[PDB]
């Protein structure tokens, strides 16, 4: 009796109000720099963080008080705030919403332009690659990054190479797990290389781990840095050179197979296109439509990837379903 | 055994991949004009809709095929598409994400400016009121609009007034339910008034329902149009004149009480600030922080609203919890 309208509405909205609010608070706070100071295991001290971020302290305090009202942080004492116990899961979920609604917003808002003159639209409406990187890392935290770590650590490698390694977090975490091991982080971006180069410094791995600043294409002609590696990792990278650079790509793959030490494998995480199964189909379709229609980059099915890795001379290929919908981890044994 | 990593990841992501993908597809499609042609009870014919929307048909077909892969539409025949059975619930959930991440995106991206010089930020970073209106209507579909309808229809009114009525859908639906009834839709926006004025035309209610183009403030001095109404409705409107126009507002409220026919009531849906209960607190906080910090509009608690309505001379005030988190429906009896 109008308690019906209420219960019916609650069931229809489900978790969407909570998620919409978490994602907006967390994107806003991350753009401010605040989210990197929130952690379930310690407090953020407003007086210091406001100074470190060059923000007015009363403004920062009203933000953290709003986030405290939302249940995302806990006010421990006066001027001190702690993230809620399940913050990292909430931030992981926010990553999916940030990626489709923020990182890829130029495609949402400008689809008509992309439909009528793609070449002009592709250069006019461009994605903010800081947002692409942050939301990808939030999604990866629980849905593909752990699986890649464990696989690399368990191979107990001596040399590990990462193509498109960014700030080299994955290499730093692997080297800190195999006490005797070396790493190579390859990235063609200047600022990415500069931050990876000092994060490795502050971990003391400045000798065990070098930060080469080249393209993955450059590997096709200079495969020297790949020599003798036990594991080569590429995360969501190889698709970005298809179909315009299929030969260069086929030849980087062939280079990787020859450069592998005995018993070594190339680990590729990438997205497969348009899955039909009920769990993955909806996010699969967004990942595929964004890549196929707006970025014009070719995503390959498992069948195509196995084909392509066989043709590069790998002797066996194992595909693993990742929790990230349409994410697959291909392990290509030499 | 690495089937653990998979099940753990799936539990951590929960419904977020599905929601993120639905919201992006549906905002993109709505901006294109396509979503208004999707319905669970009939098909969209691509050849005709592509022409009506001035879109290349192959482009429209790739979009609908992507949305079909996502499970949001069904391809009935060749060139014909039907929305999935629960489309309206999915679109309702997408409304929360659209509102926090799209409609209010100027606040997410520019919080630093709002913190350091508000007056300059408020006029530089402005919300797209087409996006505000669409996402509000998607949220309202299952979470506040039904409760307001049923209350108005059940009062069996002779005259109904709506302050900030937009395209007058709510009035059209009420007049089509009380066979003998009149309505007044008040809105100060030119284009809103022009569309309400022809939607009422195509319903034949062009006589029973007039579309006055004034401000709700203008009611404070010209209360004539309010005369004799059985029900006055205002949806998410009165807060937008607090605190800068408290006297004008207090006097519109007093005007409404005096203009009511005997047995009549004023129905106000509005948002209360920063609730603490577990269901509503997170979205409550986003609604409140957006209004308090970025729009500088005053949201009142239930206690304050009842106070304010008593002081305007209403004899009894009933507050109803809406499914929309922090939404409240206040019924103020004359
Ligand atoms: C994990 S995919 C994106 C990351 O990998 C880097 N990257 C993207 N494309 C390439 C490329 N062709 N070669 C080397 N690094 C790349 C980018 O600088 C970013 O850090
Ligand atoms: C339901 S809140 C927004 C809708 O109500 C209208 N509206 C907003 N503010 C006012 C106002 N002061 N007076 C009259 N209509 C308003 C807007 O034109 C829009 O259609
Ligand atoms: C995790 C990936 C899907 C990220 C990506 O492919 C991109 O945004 O470019
Ligand atoms: C449904 C309302 C919360 C919409 C609103 O207040 C706004 O965006 O201005
Ligand atoms: Zn990509
Ligand atoms: Zn508002």
CATH number at residue B61: 1.10.10
Q: Are residues A315 and A177 in the same domain?
A: yes
Same domain, B188 and B278: yes
Please state the φ and ψ torsions of residue B91, each to the nearest 5 degrees.
-65, -35
What would the two tokens of residue A160 be? Answer: 């590990």
Beta carbons within 8 Å of B254's beta carbon, 6+ residues apart:
B312, B313
Question: What values do phi and psi take at A286, rounded to 5?
Answer: -65, -45
Which ligand is in closest contact with the Cα of A107? 3
Q: A280 lies in a domain? A: yes
State which residue of chain A sits closest to B25, comparing Cα positions: A286
Partners of residue A71 in chain B, C-beta under 8 Å: 278, 281-282, 285
Gap from CA of A166 to ligand 1 centroid (Å): 7
Identify the nearest ligand to the CA of A136 by its number.
Answer: 3
Q: Which ligand is nearest to the CA of B217?
A: 2
Report how far residue A139's alpha carbon sits from residue B230's, in angstroms, rounded to the nearest whole number.
53
Q: Is residue B120 assigned to a domain?
A: no
In sequence order, what DSSP letters do the residues of A194-228 get, joined into one string? Answer: HHHHHHTTTTTTTTTEEEE---TGGGGT--GGGTT
Residue B120's φ and ψ, nearest 5 degrees, are: -70, -40
Question: How far is ligand 4, taken at its centre, from the CA of residue B298, in Å?
Answer: 13
Where a domain ends, among A57, A83, A109? A83
- Is A298 within the bounds of a domain? yes
Among the listed residues A87, A62, A33, the one whose alpha carbon sits nearest the alpha carbon of residue B291 = A62
Q: How far is the CA of B298 from the centre of ligand 6 (A)?
A: 9
Say whether A59 and B115 touch across the interface (CB within 8 A): yes
Chain A residues with beta carbon closer than 8 angstroms to that of B102? 101, 108
* Cα distance between residue B61 and residue B80, in whole Å: 10
Tokens describing residue A243: 């179909």
Q: Is the previous residue joined to A217 through a cis bond, with omega within 30 degrees of 0?
A: no
Pairwise CA distance, residues A102 & A128, whole Å: 9
Cis check: omega of the bond before B71, within 30 degrees of 0: no
Method underlying the structure = X-ray
Q: Is A14 annotated as a binding residue?
A: yes
**Token digits of residue B61:** 């077909």
Q: Which positions ≥6 away from B7 have C-beta within 8 Å?
A: none
Residues A165 and A272 in one domain: yes
| Residues from chain A contacting residue B2 (CB–CB below 8 Å) | 147, 150, 320
- Please list every protein residue whose CB sits less than 6 Å from any atom of ligand 2: B 164, 166, 187-189, 192, 215-217, 235-237, 240
Q: Taken in order B314, B318, B324, B325, is the CA torsion positive or negative?
A: positive
Query: Are B38 and B163 contained in the same domain?
Result: no
Cα angle for residues A185, A100, A217 (degrees, 5° grid): 30
Tell how far CA B133 is from the center of its chain: 6
Looking only at the bridges linking them, the beta strands covering B327-333 and B260-271 are antiparallel
Q: State the nearest Cα–Cα gap between A256 and chain B, in angstroms.
A: 25
d(C-alpha B333, C-alpha B310), whole Å:
10
Q: Which residue of A has its CA nearest to B107?
A: A28
Q: A115: closest CA among A330, A294, A315, A313?
A: A294
Could you tell me how many CB contacts below 8 A there are between chain A and chain B? 265
| Secondary structure of residue A39 in the 3-state scheme | strand
Mutual angle of helices A16-32 and A57-69, in 10-degree steps: 160
Q: Is residue A125 part of a domain?
A: no
User: Could you tell me if residue B91 is inside a domain?
Assistant: no
Query: Is there a single domain that holds both residue B181 and residue B328?
Result: yes
* Minimal C-alpha gap between B232 and chain A (Å): 20
Q: Which residue has the tokens 């849905």?
A: A143
Same domain, residue pair B322 and B215: yes
Among A37, A58, A83, identify where a domain stops.
A83
SS3 B208: coil
Structure tokens at A322: 């990742």
> Taking Cα atoms as reference points, which of B298, B30, B138, B10 lies closest to residue A20?
B138
Same-domain check for residues B250 and B151: yes
Q: Is A289 annotated as a binding residue?
A: yes
Contacts of B71 (CB under 8 A, 6+ apart): A278, A281, A282, A285, B84
Within a domain: A139: no
Query: Is A162:A170 a contact under the CB 8 Å cutoff?
Result: yes
Q: Where are the alpha helices (DSSP H) in B125-221?
A: 129-143, 145-154, 169-175, 190-199
Measured in angstroms, the resolution is 2.1
Distance of residue B36 Cα from the nearest chain A Cα, in angstroms: 16
Count of beta carbons in the 10 Å neighbourhood of residue B214: 14
Contacts of B56 in chain A (CB under 8 A): 115-116
Ligand 4 contacts CB of residue B287 (under 6 A) = yes
Cα–Cα distance measured from residue B79 to residue B46, given in angstroms and rounded to the nearest whole number? 5
Residue B195's Cβ-count burial label (10 Å; 0-12, 13-18, 19+) is middle
In a domain, B290, yes or no: yes
How many angstroms separate the alpha carbon of residue A271 from the centre of ligand 5? 8
C-alpha A292/C-alpha A288 separation (Å) is 6
Does residue A13 contact residue B158 with C-beta atoms inside 8 Å? no
Contact B9 A323 (CB under 8 A): yes
Q: Are residues B149 and B272 in the same domain?
A: yes
Three-state secondary-structure class, residue A135: helix
With a 6 Å cutoff on the Cβ, whether A100 touches ligand 3 is: no
Ligand nearest to the CA of B238: 2
Indicate whether A40 and A159 sit together in one domain: no
Same domain, B170 and B298: yes
Last residue of a domain, one of A68, A83, A98: A83
Minimal-distance CA residue to ligand 3 atom 5 = A236
Residue A291 Cα, ligand 6 centroid: separation in angstroms? 36
CATH number of the domain bearing residue A253: 3.40.50.150
Token reading at B11? 């539990």
By the 8 A CB rule, do B28 and A111 touch?
yes
Residues in chain B within 8 Å Cβ distance of A321: 6
Q: What's the domain count of chain B?
A: 2
Measured between CB atoms, which of B28, B92, B274 is closest to A108?
B28
C-alpha A240 – ligand 1 centre gap (Å): 9
CB contact under 8 A, A16 and B97: yes
The reply to whether B76 and B163 lie within a common domain is no
Q: What angle do CA B299, B23, A269 make, to 5 degrees?
A: 130
Q: C-alpha dihedral over B303, B305, B308, B311, to 10 degrees?
A: -70
Element (H, E) at A147: helix A145-154
Task: Give how far B116 is from chain A: nearest CA, Å.
Answer: 7
Question: Is B16:A18 a contact under the CB 8 Å cutoff?
Answer: no
Q: Which residues is B329 bridged to in the sheet? A: B269, B320
Round to whole Å and give the CA distance between A325 and B13.
10
A165: β partners: none
For residue A280, the chain B residues in CB contact (below 8 A) are 17
Q: Is B291 annotated as a binding residue?
A: yes
Alpha-carbon distance of B177 to B172, in angstroms, equals: 9
Full strand arrangement of the beta sheet holding A80-83 = A43-45, A80-83, A73-75
Pair A191, A294 in one domain: yes
User: Which residue, B119, B324, B146, is CA-closest to B236?
Assistant: B324
Owning domain of residue A161: 144-333
Q: Which of A328, A327, A325 is nearest to A280 (CA)?
A: A325
Using DSSP, state whether A264 is helix, strand or coil. strand
For residue B92, is it within any domain? no
């Amino acid at each position: 009796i109008a308690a019906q309208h209420l219960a019916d509405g609650i069931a229809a909205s489900g978790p969407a109000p909570d998620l919409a609010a978490a994602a907006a608070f967390l994107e806003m706070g991350d753009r401010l720099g605040v989210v990197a100071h929130l952690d379930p295991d310690r407090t953020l001290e407003t007086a210091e963080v406001a100074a470190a971020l060059d923000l007015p302290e009363p403004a920062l305090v009203r933000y953290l008080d709003a986030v405290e009202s939302a249940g995302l942080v806990i006010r421990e004492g006066e001027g001190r705030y702690r993230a809620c116990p399940d913050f990292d899961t909430i931030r992981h979920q926010a990553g999916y919403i940030s990626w489709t609604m923020n990182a890829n917003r130029p495609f949402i808002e400008n689809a008509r332009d992309f439909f009528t003159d793609w070449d002009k639209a592709a250069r006019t409406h461009v994605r903010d690659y800081r947002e692409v990187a942050v939301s990808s890392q939030w999604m990866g935290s629980h849905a593909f990054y752990p699986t890649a770590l464990a696989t690399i650590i368990d191979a107990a490698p001596r040399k590990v190479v990462d193509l498109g390694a960014g700030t080299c977090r994955l290499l730093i975490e692997v080297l800190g797990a195999v006490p005797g091991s070396t790493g190579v982080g390859l990235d063609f971006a200047a600022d990415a290389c500069r931050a990876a180069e000092q994060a490795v410094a502050q971990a003391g791995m400045t000798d065990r781990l070098t930060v080469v600043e080249r393209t993955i294409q450059s590997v096709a002609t200079d495969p020297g840095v790949l020599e003798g590696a036990d594991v080569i990792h590429a995360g969501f990278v190889f698709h970005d050179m298809l179909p315009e650079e299929e030969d260069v790509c086929d030849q980087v793959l062939a280079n990787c197979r020859e450069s592998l030490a005995p018993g070594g494998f190339l680990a590729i995480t990438d997205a497969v296109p348009y899955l039909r199964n009920d769990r993955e189909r909806r996010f699969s379709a967004a990942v595929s439509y964004y890549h196929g229609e707006f970025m014009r980059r070719r995503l390959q099915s498992e069948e195509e990837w196995v084909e392509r890795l066989r043709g590069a001379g790998f002797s066996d290929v194992r595909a693993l379903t990742l929790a990230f919908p349409t994410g697959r981890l291909f392990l290509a044994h030499r």
